[PDB]
Amino acid sequence: DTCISECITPNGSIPNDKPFQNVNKITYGACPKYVKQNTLKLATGMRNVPE
Amino acid sequence: STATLCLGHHAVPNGTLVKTITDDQIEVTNATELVQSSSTGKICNNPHRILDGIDCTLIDALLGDPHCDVFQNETWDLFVERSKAFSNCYPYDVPDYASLRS
Amino acid sequence: GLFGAIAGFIENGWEGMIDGWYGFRHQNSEGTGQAADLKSTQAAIDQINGKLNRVIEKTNEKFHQIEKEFSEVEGRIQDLEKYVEDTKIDLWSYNAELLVALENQHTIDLTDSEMNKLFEKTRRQLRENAEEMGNGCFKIYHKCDNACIESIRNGTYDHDVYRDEALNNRFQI
Amino acid sequence: GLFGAIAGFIENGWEGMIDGWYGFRHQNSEGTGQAADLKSTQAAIDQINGKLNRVIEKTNEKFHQIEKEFSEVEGRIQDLEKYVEDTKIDLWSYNAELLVALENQHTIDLTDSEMNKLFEKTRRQLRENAEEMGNGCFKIYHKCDNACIESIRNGTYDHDVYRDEALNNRFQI
Amino acid sequence: GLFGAIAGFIENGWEGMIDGWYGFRHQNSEGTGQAADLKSTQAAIDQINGKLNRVIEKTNEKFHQIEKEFSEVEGRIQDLEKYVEDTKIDLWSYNAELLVALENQHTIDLTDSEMNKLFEKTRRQLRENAEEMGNGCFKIYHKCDNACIESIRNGTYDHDVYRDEALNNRFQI
Ligand SMILES: *[C@@H]1O[C@H](CO)[C@@H](O)[C@H](O)[C@H]1NC(C)=O
Ligand SMILES: *[C@@H]1O[C@H](CO)[C@@H](O)[C@H](O)[C@H]1NC(C)=O
Ligand SMILES: *[C@@H]1O[C@H](CO)[C@@H](O)[C@H](O)[C@H]1NC(C)=O
Ligand SMILES: *[C@@H]1O[C@H](CO)[C@@H](O)[C@H](O)[C@H]1NC(C)=O
Ligand SMILES: *[C@@H]1O[C@H](CO)[C@@H](O)[C@H](O)[C@H]1NC(C)=O
């Protein structure tokens, strides 16, 4: 398709905003390292102790 | 006579479980996803020069199989070979096809 | 976390404080109010955004590499090619896991630390004019209207100006 | 560690306390006794068992791989095969080393932290009725029999109930 | 860092203290003076030199390996050979980066911790004979000549010996 992306994989392009990816270990371009995890949430807040 | 002053911090109704060194799941007020897990399915023609191989592998476009002559003198950043690309010329074989192709 | 303030000596958080991360709640003669502390709130934020940048920094960027999917069985070289990628993915999958667990632990302790620092500082301002109720609240032993609270909140409260009044009420009236 | 309680302001530990990790020792009119604090003791334990699980989690699980021992000399491919394994073992040997050094440091600080939290909490209960002797012991300035100690230990001690008595003895009798 | 003393409640450091890392500055009747605390200064040093040794420890030591520079183009094996080295350098370049960022954060907190421990200890010595001015300085409410300061500094100050004098000046003279 006529779009913009610097990271290409057999599955299509994926945005490289994150540092890791779990789409394909085959990539070309500026791409997120591939890992086996489908998710890894980095805490960007303090602990939540609701009322 | 007296006054009360209480120090404190915020909280949100619904938080996000995260993992730490000592806890499997611990609720925090916010989190960001570090793993990109989806694609659109499409490959983008920018900023990398993508050459769609159509029905041709790189080799048949290299040698000159009639139906690949449309690729004469082409250049690419990334050549995209299709699973169903086929040869329609004199039967050949390449000893060390992998390295020639690479 | 390491400190004891958050999910510690401060029973719980304020779902209502939507203007800052850390804050104050008072109750004097004039009534009750609430106010976020922009200073400690920004220290936590700055630090968190600081690790965020380090983490989601600049991408791999690889071009021609080696094949990772194979249609025919070949043995020896293909074996080694796959092992190379496999052991790689495994090492990067560990790194990602650990990195995220360390950061998360630190983000918690750090934010627990900024709470506990707001407390000690505010505690050091009140001098002998107050006592800690043990729940993150200080009992101020003197008349403290709103402009008095504001000075504590904005760091200009002079303790001498209320010391004797304070001391009196504190020590057996 | 980072806190100062363990191997810090608390001279040493109690070889005799075999019922908990953290505890209390008092000396009042009725005599002397000892009791483990099950609450802080379980916080340290939970956290430690929590990292223990993360660490000794689920195994590699590899099947057909590549050869690592060779009987004949072959050059090029064999060179690369060995280097691949060697650089792998080296990277996993670093990870293991570092992981164990980080965890160990944290386990110490964390357990030093739970000691220091027991102290501040107990300190915040006593209000003006006590003073810290600087060795982890609080001098309680009022008559405190066993049921009085028990209430401190179980978190129900009311300081007002002994304040004036306390204040009196404290401030020049 | 996590504590609040350094670049925290202690406004700034002393460019002049060249005999220790942590220290004291007093102002009594006899005048003003300064002295480094060799004990806390050596705790920070020991710990820092301790990580320094761990880090710059014992070298790789590799002999015959694989080729990393190529004059002719060959494909498949050469592709894999380069990828093997490349992914290796990349993994070691991450390790080095992270290791240095973790250590640095810890060295700061740790040295912030030894400052804050000097404070609490000195604070626990003064008992009721002093108040904290909130800037790392204690206001001693009793006559304290040089030999008096020295005893605080060397850990032998007895608070009873000045308590009543202290208490008197403290509580409304
Ligand atoms: C990407 O492709 C492979 C097959 O090409 C598939 O196994 C994998 O699950 C796909 N990932 C996504 C997000 O579609
Ligand atoms: C959660 O944190 C992320 C990263 O800083 C940010 O995108 C978002 O604003 C935060 N969520 C909320 C509700 O503020
Ligand atoms: C602190 O509080 C008093 C009372 O409202 C005010 O006069 C003073 O200027 C305040 N300072 C700041 C920095 O807001
Ligand atoms: C605390 O101590 C007193 C004295 O023995 C007792 O009456 C009280 O119920 C105790 N509380 C708990 C939870 O054990
Ligand atoms: C502490 O100070 C006093 C006063 O100078 C002195 O007699 C005492 O022996 C000192 N102790 C040490 C260990 O220097």
UniProtKB/Swiss-Prot annotation, chain A:
Paired cysteines (S-S)? 7-31
Glycosylation sites recorded in the entry for this protein: 11
Q: What is this protein called?
A: Hemagglutinin HA1 chain
Full-protein residues shown here are 291 to 341 of 566
Curated annotation (Swiss-Prot), chains C, D, E:
Please give the coiled-coil regions recorded for this protein: none
Q: Which cysteines are joined by disulfide bonds?
A: 144-148
Write down the glycosylated positions: 154
Top-level taxon: Viruses
Q: What is the name of this protein?
A: Hemagglutinin HA2 chain
The full protein's residues present here are 346 to 518 of 566
